Design a protein around this ligand. Sequence first.
Ligand SMILES: Cc1ncc(COP(=O)(O)O)c(C=O)c1O
Ligand SMILES: Cc1ncc(COP(=O)(O)O)c(C=O)c1O
Lengths: 374, 368
Amino acid sequence: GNELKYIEEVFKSNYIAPLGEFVNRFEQSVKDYSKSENALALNSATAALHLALRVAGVKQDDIVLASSFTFIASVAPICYLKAKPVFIDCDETYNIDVDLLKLAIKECEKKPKALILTHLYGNAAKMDEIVEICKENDIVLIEDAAEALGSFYKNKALGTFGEFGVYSYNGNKIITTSGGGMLIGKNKEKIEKARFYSTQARENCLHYEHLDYGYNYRLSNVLGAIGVAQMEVLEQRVLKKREIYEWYKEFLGEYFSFLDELENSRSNRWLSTALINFDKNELNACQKDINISQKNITLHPKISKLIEDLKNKQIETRPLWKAMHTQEVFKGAKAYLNGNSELFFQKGICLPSGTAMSKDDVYEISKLILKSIK
Amino acid sequence: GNELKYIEEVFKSGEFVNRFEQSVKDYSKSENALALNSATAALHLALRVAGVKQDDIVLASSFTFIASVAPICYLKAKPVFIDCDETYNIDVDLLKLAIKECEKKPKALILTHLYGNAAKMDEIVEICKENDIVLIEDAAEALGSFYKNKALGTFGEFGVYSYNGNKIITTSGGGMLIGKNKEKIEKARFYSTQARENCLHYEHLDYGYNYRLSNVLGAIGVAQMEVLEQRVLKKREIYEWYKEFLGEYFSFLDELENSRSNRWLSTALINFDKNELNACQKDINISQKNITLHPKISKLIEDLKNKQIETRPLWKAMHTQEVFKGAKAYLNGNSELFFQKGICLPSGTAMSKDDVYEISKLILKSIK
Ligand SMILES: Cc1ncc(COP(=O)(O)O)c(C=O)c1O
Ligand SMILES: Cc1ncc(COP(=O)(O)O)c(C=O)c1O
């Protein structure tokens, strides 16, 4: 895209242009796309979530509901504020199950202050129900749409349903080319308070004056430039991601299950995923509450062999997220299970979904998979 | 100026993050380096790996930027601030006093090397050693500074460097955490990427952060390090020119003997004399405090601003900030005095001797 062009512009005009020009443009491009009225460009989605929780009023020992089937970066902010996480298993969309959410809220001795809802692999959660449950229980809804930029629910962009929404831009490898997150929200005052915290909580004075403490979370102009470049081709990439998903479905549909997106929703399919030897009757094996303890989850034989085989053909595939309710870090925390996230880890596979791939690449990969599973 | 070159290579496809860390090890001689999003993040990780917990006591420089002490707040630890000496850094005697009076042994000391000036390292290192206090050097503005030919940041168990100034929004970004213990630095590298165990899937025994620098900013970092020494020499030239043109009315305090300040920011004091140092000795329970700038300083800043020339007051000490209300601070009156009579001058390396001369003339005109 125009990444190099914009970065060159940043260095060339730094001496004369307005402050944070590309950061401003990046925020505006997200506002234009999502239709949110407020946007704040930060160093990461984790930082965006951290600020969202703080401006929402979350304090030490407060209760925060969160998805169990997710990446730990979505819930670590709860730990930063020393709040207590309550994890909820998922449904057929890979997202928080409505039944379990209601159960958790009903049984909480202390009322939860907020809910961090993850839209896993770009799939939309059942928003109408979740939004209502949060409203009726006075729970602040914070959408973790880190991998859901470009996803929609009934023509509305994921991230714009809760009081706060968060987007990420570069995947989750340990080291990435670029970096950055965007915090969006309904309340201008709260978002502007976050913009204040994002730069060390400075008062408007000639010198440095501080009434509170903040962070160093503001995005740089160089990364903002890359962000603008990425937003310019977002829709195109979303369309390509979906084409890739459909190709995988076409070539593997006979042996793998490709769970449908919610009706009247549009998943960005940022990463294509599939389940082997799966039947919907396997869902919701239980409905129990537990105190978390670490546990390993055995990969289905075909999945472990698949990853190994494709690995020898220079193709990288990965297991799905390992639920938070099975992680040692959250030992002792409350969790509500139905068995779905563990089942998905057991039979799921994350497939190569780079938009640079052609139909032949997807076909060749699929051919190698079919050969391995039989 | 290889920034654009390296960036292009990045796009043509963590190479540069690794090269950035290597360049810092090559320059500072530290055996361990970790590239992060900011110096604040680096200090945050240093404190955590150092073992700081909620309610632990952490000593810190009062005359500094809040970004250097905010991490204490992140871990809910308790700060104890210490005033400065003629180097702009922590006064050795006040440091000993604070340690002597502490109800319980402080876990660490965050020592700032203000405006690049070296602190009295031999004494401070010894004090921390004798009291089993972890020394963490905030060398955010001191990359290129040395004490007895040893790079600032390499005296403590941990050291932190920053790269792009304090503008509310900067072109680039980044920080570097260096340290003496490989295991501790590798633990920080672990925390910097969400505390992932080394395996195919995601497994976590602890929680971490997303503090790891991106490859693009790493590329910029490498380019900045390659010209660091040249920049420092120019910064020092600029400092000397200001001293030559303004030395009759402004005081430019000398760097410690056998030390080398990078003079990243040229600063000076008006109507100042060493005799007014250490005038008000006492300790307090912090309360917000307004400090009026010396009449000539405030006017100077105004005049230069009307000439499109930006100057700024020196850092306003933490012991005068509302955010730290209640916290303990040991003072001698120096950081407040420096704030009232100090000025931070334009220090861009692209400035020529004539440019500094012209700025100096406007300054002399302003103060009459
Ligand atoms: C579902 C999800 N939530 C949160 C995050 C955290 O975002 P970041 O990596 O930008 O800190 C990620 C990683 O991108 C993610 O995939
Ligand atoms: C003296 C000092 N300490 C700490 C910091 C914080 O560093 P960063 O802005 O990279 O988080 C700065 C800003 O550069 C600084 O000037």
